[PDB]
Coordinates of all heavy atoms in Angstrom, one line a residue:
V1 N 313.2 125.0 -62.4 CA 313.2 124.3 -63.7 C 313.8 122.9 -63.8 O 314.8 122.7 -63.2 CB 314.0 125.3 -64.8 CG1 313.2 126.6 -65.0 CG2 315.4 125.7 -64.3
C2 N 313.2 122.1 -64.5 CA 313.6 120.7 -64.7 C 313.9 120.5 -66.2 O 313.2 121.0 -67.0 CB 312.5 119.8 -64.2 SG 311.8 120.0 -62.5
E3 N 314.8 119.7 -66.6 CA 315.1 119.4 -68.0 C 314.7 118.0 -68.4 O 314.8 117.0 -67.7 CB 316.6 119.5 -68.3 CG 317.0 119.4 -69.7 CD 318.5 119.4 -69.9 OE1 319.2 118.7 -69.2 OE2 319.0 120.2 -70.7
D4 N 314.2 117.9 -69.6 CA 313.6 116.6 -70.2 C 313.9 116.6 -71.7 O 314.1 117.7 -72.3 CB 312.1 116.5 -69.9 CG 311.2 117.5 -70.7 OD1 311.3 117.5 -71.9 OD2 310.5 118.1 -70.0
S5 N 313.7 115.5 -72.3 CA 313.9 115.3 -73.7 C 312.7 114.7 -74.4 O 312.8 114.0 -75.4 CB 315.1 114.4 -74.0 OG 316.1 115.0 -73.1
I6 N 311.5 115.0 -73.9 CA 310.2 114.5 -74.4 C 309.9 115.1 -75.8 O 309.2 114.4 -76.5 CB 309.0 114.6 -73.5 CG1 308.6 116.1 -73.3 CG2 309.3 113.9 -72.2 CD1 307.3 116.2 -72.5
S7 N 310.5 116.2 -76.1 CA 310.2 116.8 -77.4 C 311.4 116.3 -78.4 O 311.7 117.0 -79.3 CB 310.2 118.3 -77.2 OG 311.5 118.7 -76.9
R8 N 312.1 115.3 -77.9 CA 313.2 114.7 -78.6 C 314.5 115.6 -78.4 O 315.5 115.3 -78.8 CB 312.9 114.4 -80.1 CG 311.6 113.5 -80.1 CD 311.2 113.3 -81.6 NE 312.1 112.2 -82.2 CZ 311.6 111.0 -82.3 NH1 310.4 110.8 -82.5 NH2 312.6 110.1 -82.4
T9 N 314.2 116.8 -77.9 CA 315.4 117.8 -77.8 C 315.4 118.0 -76.2 O 314.3 118.2 -75.7 CB 315.2 119.0 -78.5 OG1 314.6 118.7 -79.8 CG2 316.6 119.7 -78.9
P10 N 316.5 118.1 -75.5 CA 316.5 118.6 -74.1 C 316.1 120.0 -74.0 O 316.6 120.8 -74.6 CB 317.8 118.2 -73.6 CG 318.7 118.2 -74.8 CD 317.8 117.6 -76.0
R11 N 315.1 120.3 -73.2 CA 314.6 121.6 -73.0 C 314.4 121.7 -71.5 O 314.0 120.7 -70.8 CB 313.3 121.8 -73.6 CG 313.4 121.6 -75.2 CD 312.1 122.0 -75.8 NE 312.3 121.7 -77.3 CZ 312.4 122.7 -78.1 NH1 312.5 123.9 -77.7 NH2 312.5 122.4 -79.4
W12 N 314.5 122.8 -71.0 CA 314.2 123.2 -69.5 C 312.8 123.8 -69.5 O 312.5 124.5 -70.4 CB 315.2 124.3 -69.0 CG 316.6 123.8 -68.9 CD1 317.6 123.9 -69.9 CD2 317.1 123.3 -67.9 NE1 318.5 123.3 -69.4 CE2 318.4 122.9 -68.1 CE3 316.5 123.0 -66.6 CZ2 319.2 122.3 -67.1 CZ3 317.3 122.3 -65.6 CH2 318.6 122.0 -65.9
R13 N 312.0 123.4 -68.6 CA 310.6 123.9 -68.5 C 310.4 124.5 -67.1 O 311.1 124.0 -66.1 CB 309.6 122.6 -68.6 CG 310.0 121.9 -69.9 CD 308.8 120.9 -70.2 NE 309.1 120.2 -71.4 CZ 308.6 120.3 -72.6 NH1 307.6 121.2 -72.7 NH2 309.0 119.7 -73.6
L14 N 309.5 125.4 -66.9 CA 309.3 126.0 -65.6 C 308.2 125.1 -65.0 O 307.1 125.0 -65.4 CB 308.7 127.4 -65.9 CG 308.4 128.2 -64.7 CD1 309.7 128.5 -63.9 CD2 307.7 129.6 -65.1
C15 N 308.6 124.3 -63.9 CA 307.8 123.4 -63.2 C 307.2 124.1 -61.9 O 306.2 123.8 -61.4 CB 308.5 122.2 -62.8 SG 309.0 121.2 -64.2
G16 N 308.0 125.1 -61.4 CA 307.5 125.7 -60.1 C 307.9 127.2 -60.1 O 308.8 127.6 -60.9
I17 N 307.3 127.9 -59.2 CA 307.5 129.4 -59.0 C 307.9 129.4 -57.5 O 307.0 128.9 -56.8 CB 306.2 130.2 -59.3 CG1 305.8 130.1 -60.8 CG2 306.6 131.7 -59.0 CD1 304.6 131.0 -61.1
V18 N 309.0 130.0 -57.2 CA 309.5 130.1 -55.7 C 308.3 130.8 -55.1 O 308.0 132.0 -55.3 CB 310.7 130.9 -55.8 CG1 311.1 131.1 -54.4 CG2 311.8 130.2 -56.5
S19 N 307.7 130.2 -54.1 CA 306.6 131.0 -53.4 C 306.8 131.2 -51.8 O 306.7 132.3 -51.4 CB 305.3 130.1 -53.7 OG 304.1 130.8 -53.0
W20 N 307.0 130.2 -51.0 CA 307.2 130.5 -49.6 C 307.9 129.3 -48.8 O 308.2 128.3 -49.3 CB 305.8 130.8 -48.9 CG 304.8 129.7 -49.0 CD1 304.1 129.4 -50.1 CD2 304.5 128.8 -48.1 NE1 303.4 128.4 -49.9 CE2 303.5 127.9 -48.6 CE3 304.9 128.5 -46.8 CZ2 303.0 126.8 -47.8 CZ3 304.5 127.5 -45.9 CH2 303.5 126.7 -46.5
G21 N 308.1 129.5 -47.6 CA 308.7 128.5 -46.7 C 308.8 129.1 -45.2 O 308.6 130.3 -45.1
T22 N 309.2 128.3 -44.3 CA 309.4 128.8 -42.9 C 310.9 129.0 -42.9 O 311.6 127.9 -43.0 CB 308.9 127.8 -41.9 OG1 307.5 127.9 -42.0 CG2 309.2 128.1 -40.4
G23 N 311.4 130.2 -42.7 CA 312.8 130.6 -42.6 C 313.4 130.1 -43.9 O 312.7 129.9 -44.9
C24 N 314.7 129.8 -43.9 CA 315.4 129.3 -45.1 C 316.4 128.2 -44.7 O 317.1 128.5 -43.8 CB 316.0 130.4 -45.8 SG 315.0 131.9 -46.3
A25 N 316.4 127.3 -45.5 CA 317.4 126.1 -45.5 C 317.3 125.3 -44.1 O 318.3 124.7 -43.9 CB 318.8 126.6 -45.7
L26 N 316.3 125.4 -43.4 CA 316.0 124.6 -42.1 C 315.7 123.2 -42.5 O 315.2 122.9 -43.6 CB 314.9 125.1 -41.3 CG 315.2 126.5 -40.6 CD1 315.6 127.5 -41.5 CD2 313.9 126.9 -39.8
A27 N 316.0 122.2 -41.6 CA 315.7 120.9 -41.9 C 314.2 120.8 -41.7 O 313.6 121.5 -40.9 CB 316.4 119.9 -40.9
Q28 N 313.6 119.9 -42.4 CA 312.1 119.6 -42.4 C 311.2 120.9 -42.8 O 310.0 120.8 -42.6 CB 311.8 119.1 -41.0 CG 312.9 118.0 -40.7 CD 312.3 117.1 -39.7 OE1 311.8 117.4 -38.7 NE2 312.3 115.8 -40.1
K29 N 311.8 121.9 -43.3 CA 311.0 123.2 -43.7 C 311.5 123.6 -45.1 O 312.2 124.5 -45.3 CB 311.2 124.4 -42.7 CG 310.6 124.0 -41.4 CD 309.0 123.8 -41.4 CE 308.4 123.3 -40.1 NZ 308.9 121.9 -39.8
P30 N 311.3 122.7 -46.1 CA 311.7 122.8 -47.5 C 311.1 124.0 -48.2 O 310.3 124.7 -47.5 CB 311.3 121.5 -48.2 CG 310.0 121.1 -47.4 CD 310.4 121.4 -45.9
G31 N 311.3 124.2 -49.4 CA 310.7 125.4 -50.1 C 309.4 125.0 -50.7 O 309.3 123.8 -51.1
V32 N 308.5 125.8 -50.7 CA 307.2 125.6 -51.4 C 307.0 126.4 -52.7 O 307.2 127.6 -52.8 CB 306.0 125.9 -50.4 CG1 304.7 125.4 -50.8 CG2 306.4 125.5 -48.9
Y33 N 306.7 125.8 -53.8 CA 306.5 126.3 -55.1 C 305.1 126.2 -55.6 O 304.4 125.3 -55.2 CB 307.5 125.5 -56.1 CG 308.9 125.7 -55.6 CD1 309.4 124.9 -54.5 CD2 309.8 126.6 -56.1 CE1 310.7 125.0 -54.0 CE2 311.1 126.7 -55.7 CZ 311.5 125.9 -54.6 OH 312.8 126.2 -54.2
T34 N 304.8 127.0 -56.5 CA 303.5 127.1 -57.1 C 303.7 126.0 -58.2 O 304.7 126.0 -58.8 CB 303.1 128.5 -57.8 OG1 303.1 129.4 -56.7 CG2 301.6 128.5 -58.5
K35 N 302.7 125.1 -58.5 CA 302.9 124.0 -59.5 C 302.3 124.6 -60.8 O 301.1 124.9 -60.9 CB 302.1 122.8 -59.1 CG 302.5 121.7 -59.9 CD 301.6 120.5 -59.8 CE 301.4 120.0 -58.3 NZ 300.6 118.7 -58.4
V36 N 303.2 125.0 -61.6 CA 302.8 125.6 -63.0 C 302.0 124.7 -63.8 O 301.1 125.3 -64.5 CB 304.1 125.9 -63.7 CG1 303.9 126.7 -65.1 CG2 305.0 126.9 -62.8
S37 N 302.2 123.4 -63.9 CA 301.3 122.6 -64.7 C 299.8 122.9 -64.5 O 299.0 122.8 -65.4 CB 301.7 121.1 -64.5 OG 301.5 120.9 -63.1

């Protein structure tokens, strides 16, 4: 989730869904999310 004030009020929106990656926290193998928009 990312927070913005485009509705004039700060709100958190669901921008991604945790989906996959190679191992975890390795350099150059970041996490991959489903793009909700």
Side-chain angles (χ1 to χ4, degrees):
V1 295
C2 310
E3 185 182 49
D4 69 57
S5 310
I6 66 175
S7 65
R8 305 178 77 107
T9 319
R11 298 184 185 255
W12 291 88
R13 311 196 181 247
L14 184 61
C15 296
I17 298 183
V18 179
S19 181
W20 62 279
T22 286
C24 305
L26 283 57
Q28 317 207 302
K29 294 295 173 293
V32 194
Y33 301 78
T34 298
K35 193 193 305 188
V36 181
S37 54

